[PDB]
Design a protein around this ligand. Structure first.
Ligand code: NA
Ligand code: NA
Lengths: 30, 30, 30, 30
């Protein structure tokens, strides 16, 4: 239970970081 | 350029976090 | 502005990751 | 052992994210 929940939180953070990366690419590219 | 480099590093960190999440799930499940 | 907002979100994610690290250390040590 | 090592990896990632945040702030500010 608790490790699975922490793992899920890490997966959500990874998704958030991928969103930020996309946003930075769009700023760079226009 | 710098934003492209940073975006790449964020994608790489996201991948690392997913690998850590996987290891946590492995520890939990056996 | 957008880079300031993103920087803030990265700092917030960093804080979250440290909180998760702390929880893992707590689980390990009891 | 293994949870402590994972926690340390998360702390290093948090430090890396703080570096990126600083870099973005410096880009924004000049
Ligand atoms: Na750039
Ligand atoms: Na900006």
């Amino acid at each position: 239970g608790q490790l699975e929940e922490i793992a899920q939180q890490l997966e959500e953070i990874a998704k958030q970081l991928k969103k930020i990366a996309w946003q930075l690419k769009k700023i760079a590219q226009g």
